[PDB]
Design an enzyme around this catalytic site. Structure first.
Site, PDB file in Angstrom:
ATOM      1  N   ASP A 113      76.350 -65.207  53.529  1.00 49.77           N
ATOM      2  CA  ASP A 113      75.991 -64.243  52.502  1.00 49.77           C
ATOM      3  C   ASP A 113      75.244 -63.063  53.101  1.00 49.77           C
ATOM      4  O   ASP A 113      74.243 -62.603  52.549  1.00 49.77           O
ATOM      5  CB  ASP A 113      75.173 -64.867  51.373  1.00 49.77           C
ATOM      6  CG  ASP A 113      75.075 -63.957  50.148  1.00 49.77           C
ATOM      7  OD1 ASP A 113      75.957 -63.101  49.967  1.00 49.77           O
ATOM      8  OD2 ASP A 113      74.107 -64.084  49.373  1.00 49.77           O
ATOM      9  N   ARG A 150      71.080 -56.737  50.531  1.00 45.84           N
ATOM     10  CA  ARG A 150      70.094 -57.342  49.641  1.00 45.84           C
ATOM     11  C   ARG A 150      69.420 -58.559  50.254  1.00 45.84           C
ATOM     12  O   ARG A 150      68.399 -58.999  49.731  1.00 45.84           O
ATOM     13  CB  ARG A 150      70.735 -57.757  48.317  1.00 45.84           C
ATOM     14  CG  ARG A 150      71.944 -58.623  48.498  1.00 45.84           C
ATOM     15  CD  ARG A 150      72.612 -58.992  47.172  1.00 45.84           C
ATOM     16  NE  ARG A 150      73.976 -59.429  47.436  1.00 45.84           N
ATOM     17  CZ  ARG A 150      74.280 -60.612  47.935  1.00 45.84           C
ATOM     18  NH1 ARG A 150      73.330 -61.484  48.193  1.00 45.84           N
ATOM     19  NH2 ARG A 150      75.526 -60.918  48.188  1.00 45.84           N
ATOM     20  N   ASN A 151      69.983 -59.114  51.329  1.00 44.97           N
ATOM     21  CA  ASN A 151      69.440 -60.272  52.024  1.00 44.97           C
ATOM     22  C   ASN A 151      68.739 -59.890  53.319  1.00 44.97           C
ATOM     23  O   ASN A 151      68.528 -60.743  54.172  1.00 44.97           O
ATOM     24  CB  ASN A 151      70.533 -61.309  52.319  1.00 44.97           C
ATOM     25  CG  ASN A 151      70.755 -62.278  51.162  1.00 44.97           C
ATOM     26  OD1 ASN A 151      69.852 -62.541  50.394  1.00 44.97           O
ATOM     27  ND2 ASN A 151      71.975 -62.804  51.044  1.00 44.97           N
ATOM     28  N   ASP A 175      67.883 -65.054  53.569  1.00 42.71           N
ATOM     29  CA  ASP A 175      68.887 -65.550  52.628  1.00 42.71           C
ATOM     30  C   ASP A 175      68.154 -65.993  51.374  1.00 42.71           C
ATOM     31  O   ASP A 175      67.500 -67.035  51.378  1.00 42.71           O
ATOM     32  CB  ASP A 175      69.696 -66.696  53.221  1.00 42.71           C
ATOM     33  CG  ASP A 175      70.852 -67.126  52.320  1.00 42.71           C
ATOM     34  OD1 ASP A 175      70.942 -66.641  51.179  1.00 42.71           O
ATOM     35  OD2 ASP A 175      71.670 -67.939  52.763  1.00 42.71           O
TER      36      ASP A 175
HETATM   37  C1  LIG Z   1      59.618 -67.008  50.694  1.00 39.93           C
HETATM   38  C2  LIG Z   1      60.971 -67.066  51.393  1.00 39.93           C
HETATM   39  C3  LIG Z   1      61.723 -68.214  51.360  1.00 39.93           C
HETATM   40  C4  LIG Z   1      62.962 -68.257  52.004  1.00 39.93           C
HETATM   41  C5  LIG Z   1      63.429 -67.122  52.662  1.00 39.93           C
HETATM   42  C6  LIG Z   1      64.782 -67.126  53.421  1.00 39.93           C
HETATM   43  O1  LIG Z   1      65.269 -66.111  53.762  1.00 39.93           O
HETATM   44  N1  LIG Z   1      65.366 -68.456  53.736  1.00 39.93           N
HETATM   45  C7  LIG Z   1      66.583 -68.651  54.498  1.00 39.93           C
HETATM   46  C8  LIG Z   1      67.377 -69.766  54.266  1.00 39.93           C
HETATM   47  C9  LIG Z   1      68.519 -69.957  55.033  1.00 39.93           C
HETATM   48  C10 LIG Z   1      68.851 -69.060  56.023  1.00 39.93           C
HETATM   49  C11 LIG Z   1      68.050 -67.980  56.261  1.00 39.93           C
HETATM   50  C12 LIG Z   1      68.402 -66.973  57.345  1.00 39.93           C
HETATM   51  F1  LIG Z   1      69.360 -67.511  58.139  1.00 39.93           F
HETATM   52  F2  LIG Z   1      68.830 -65.842  56.754  1.00 39.93           F
HETATM   53  F3  LIG Z   1      67.288 -66.691  58.085  1.00 39.93           F
HETATM   54  C13 LIG Z   1      66.884 -67.783  55.484  1.00 39.93           C
HETATM   55  C14 LIG Z   1      62.664 -65.976  52.714  1.00 39.93           C
HETATM   56  C15 LIG Z   1      61.444 -65.938  52.074  1.00 39.93           C
HETATM   57  N2  LIG Z   1      60.649 -64.692  52.139  1.00 39.93           N
HETATM   58  C16 LIG Z   1      60.694 -63.691  51.048  1.00 39.93           C
HETATM   59  N3  LIG Z   1      61.335 -63.945  49.929  1.00 39.93           N
HETATM   60  C17 LIG Z   1      61.391 -63.063  48.936  1.00 39.93           C
HETATM   61  C18 LIG Z   1      62.174 -63.477  47.659  1.00 39.93           C
HETATM   62  C19 LIG Z   1      62.054 -62.745  46.481  1.00 39.93           C
HETATM   63  C20 LIG Z   1      62.774 -63.179  45.382  1.00 39.93           C
HETATM   64  C21 LIG Z   1      63.585 -64.334  45.502  1.00 39.93           C
HETATM   65  N4  LIG Z   1      63.670 -65.005  46.636  1.00 39.93           N
HETATM   66  C22 LIG Z   1      63.001 -64.618  47.697  1.00 39.93           C
HETATM   67  N5  LIG Z   1      60.789 -61.874  49.015  1.00 39.93           N
HETATM   68  C23 LIG Z   1      60.096 -61.521  50.135  1.00 39.93           C
HETATM   69  C24 LIG Z   1      60.034 -62.412  51.172  1.00 39.93           C
HETATM   70  C25 LIG Z   1      59.264 -61.782  52.181  1.00 39.93           C
HETATM   71  N6  LIG Z   1      58.904 -60.580  51.737  1.00 39.93           N
HETATM   72  N7  LIG Z   1      59.398 -60.417  50.517  1.00 39.93           N
HETATM   73  C26 LIG Z   1      59.207 -59.222  49.730  1.00 39.93           C
END
Ligand SMILES: Cc1ccc(C(=O)Nc2cccc(C(F)(F)F)c2)cc1Nc1nc(-c2cccnc2)nc2c1cnn2C
Length: 261
Positions: free
Chosen positions: A129, A133-134, A147
């Site tokens: 994905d 936006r990600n 993600d």
């Molecule tokens: C809190 C959080 C939790 C999870 C992830 C995330 O990206 N996880 C993930 C899972 C699988 C693979 C990967 C990858 F391969 F891509 F690395 C990542 C990021 C954030 N951090 C944030 N989340 C949200 C957010 C906001 C609304 C809904 N979901 C998440 N807003 C944020 C942050 C940091 N700064 N801000 C503004």
């Protein structure tokens, strides 16, 4: 999966919602370390799905991949913590800054995103994905691949044609998505394929149509997009070659002055 004591963690404003509950802004104050801002997913049954994401995130240590700070599992609420990115998601950040970053800055953003994906691909992790936006943007414009999954603050227009149909997801299908991200970035966050319906996008792609160069887009960058969108997935560049191509552009910025008519 570093465990964090809750007394270090103080929850502040809600910034969005996730599959398992709220997502909040917060602060983290650990022994011997400065106080920093963090973003926190909170969370109920005995489902370990919430924490399974943290086990995935903990494998990743790279300047262009969102950095897991840690988890709380011996408390309520159960939480996943990452660094907080002040500029938020890349697509909305660019729309807010339409026309206000130079081509060289935009290329640096794309180079960072490509480096993060190069790392994931080397790790045999297929994102599935990848989209502006990600991507989160820090105060220094460093872009970090993230993600958010099911979130709020079904996306076929970023997906390679073989992944839509045959459900064949590979790093080469992520390369397709990366080319879409390149277009989103050089368009300052325009929606890919404008207001076309998902069906219209699938049909257009099958008819070999491809998004055209955004205004002021260097021709060499649009060609790189077209390379990422080759129908034969084996013909697309791999992420190492993508990074190298962007690095060549940064070294030879005269090449970025050539735009189309
Ligand atoms: C809190 C959080 C939790 C999870 C992830 C995330 O990206 N996880 C993930 C899972 C699988 C693979 C990967 C990858 F391969 F891509 F690395 C990542 C990021 C954030 N951090 C944030 N989340 C949200 C957010 C906001 C609304 C809904 N979901 C998440 N807003 C944020 C942050 C940091 N700064 N801000 C503004």
């Amino acid at each position: 999966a570093k465990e964090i004591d809750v007394s270090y963690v103080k929850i502040e404003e809600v910034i969005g919602a996730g599959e398992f509950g709220e997502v909040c802004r917060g602060r983290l104050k650990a022994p011997g370390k400065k106080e920093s801002c963090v973003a926190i997913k909170t969370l109920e049954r005995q489902r370990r799905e919430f924490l399974s994401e943290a086990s995935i995130m903990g494998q990743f240590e790279h300047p262009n991949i969102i950095r897991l700070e840690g988890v709380v599992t011996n408390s309520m609420p159960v939480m996943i913590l990452t660094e907080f990115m002040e500029n938020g998601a890349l697509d909305s950040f660019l729309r807010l800054n339409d026309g206000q970053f130079t081509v060289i800055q935009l290329v640096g953003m794309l180079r960072g995103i490509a480096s993060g994906m190069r790392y994931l691909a080397e790790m045999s992790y297929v994102h599935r994905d990848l989209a502006a936006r990600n991507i989160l943007v820090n105060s220094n414009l460093v872009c970090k691949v993230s993600d958010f999954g099911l979130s709020r603050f079904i996306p076929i227009r970023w997906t390679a044609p073989e992944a839509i149909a045959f459900r064949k997801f590979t790093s080469a299908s992520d390369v397709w998505s990366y080319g879409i991200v390149m277009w989103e970035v050089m368009s300052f966050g325009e929606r890919p394929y404008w207001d076309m319906s998902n069906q219209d996008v699938i049909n257009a792609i099958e008819q070999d149509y491809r998004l055209p160069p955004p205004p002021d887009c260097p021709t060499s960058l649009h060609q790189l997009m077209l390379d990422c969108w080759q129908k034969d997935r084996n013909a697309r560049p791999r992420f190492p070659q993508i990074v190298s191509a962007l690095d060549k552009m940064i070294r030879n910025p005269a090449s970025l002055k050539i735009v189309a008519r």
